[PDB]
């Protein structure tokens, strides 16, 4: 891996480890998830730990949410679809700046209106300034 991919995986880990002690628990993950619309259940919250919890001490760290991360980069297309919904508010099919910054700011990250920019620029694959699903997938997933 570059050295960008790697303070980008870095970044990641972030959004999900609030109290940043370098653990991902599962409160933290069951608050991340209910900001981005949806209700995991208290087991549910453990399975996605145990999937990737190869140490057994009920947490995630880096090299195990890197892990997870190689895993979801699946064929479930429906979590695809079901995290464009959550940032298409809208629901017009494009995800703009505007709706990204809404949900960037409901996981509490601190964000430039350009560094905004920039992930939509990075997403964005036609130039029209948005991101719809196919750019969105090939965002999501190793597509491309
Ligand atoms: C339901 O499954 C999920 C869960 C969480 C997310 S996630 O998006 O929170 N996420 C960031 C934390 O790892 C993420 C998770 C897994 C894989 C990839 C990402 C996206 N990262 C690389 C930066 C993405 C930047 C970006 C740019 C342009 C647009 Cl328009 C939108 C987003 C996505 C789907
Ligand atoms: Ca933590
Ligand atoms: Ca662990
Ligand atoms: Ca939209
Ligand atoms: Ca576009």
Redesign the pocket.
């Known amino acids: 891996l570059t050295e960008e991919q790697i303070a980008?995986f870095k970044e990641?880990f972030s959004?999900?480890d609030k109290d940043g002690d370098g653990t991902i628990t599962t409160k933290e993950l069951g608050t991340v998830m209910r900001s981005?619309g949806?209700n995991p259940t208290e087991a549910e919250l453990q399975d996605m730990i145990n999937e990737v919890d190869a140490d057994g001490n009920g947490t995630i760290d880096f090299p195990e949410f890197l892990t997870m991360?190689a895993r979801?980069?699946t064929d479930s297309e429906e979590?695809?679809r079901?995290?464009f919904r959550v940032?298409d508010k809208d629901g017009n099919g494009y995800?703009s700046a505007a709706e990204?910054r809404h949900?960037m700011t409901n996981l509490g990250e601190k964000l430039t209106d350009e560094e905004v920019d920039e992930?939509?620029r990075?997403?964005d694959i036609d130039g029209d300034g948005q991101?719809n699903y196919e750019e969105?997938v090939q965002?999501?997933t190793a597509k491309n």
């Open positions: 980008e990641a959004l999900f981005l949806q991360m979801k980069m979590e695809i079901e995290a940032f995800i990204l949900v992930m939509i990075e997403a991101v969105f965002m999501m």
